[PDB]
Ligand binder design. Sequence first.
Ligand SMILES: [Cu+2]
Length: 123
Amino acid sequence: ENIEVHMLNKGAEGAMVFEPAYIKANPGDTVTFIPVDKGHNVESIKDMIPEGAEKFKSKINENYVLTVTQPGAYLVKCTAHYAMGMIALIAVGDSPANLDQIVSAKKPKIVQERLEKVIASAK
Ligand SMILES: [Cu+2]
């Protein structure tokens, strides 16, 4: 199946967000990223995607379709607004082995606060 995500300047959680920011999927599913406001893109974060998965980076303002194959957790960002908190977490399959690692990894404070909310109040 396909899951649609929008990139916006302002959403429910504040400025610069992915909606939804928590995406549950299975291998073979697609995630379609649609920039409803200009200036956004999607890029996998180094050391925060499963072992065996390929890194990716979309073009700004382009609709992008990600096919997820490896199970595990993926943290993605908008290349431009990462430091302002613009991230989404993709959970492929159950009990993603690398989730606790991703939660502990170094990242901007604002990112950490949103991630913690998405994992709790959005799981
Ligand atoms: Cu952005």
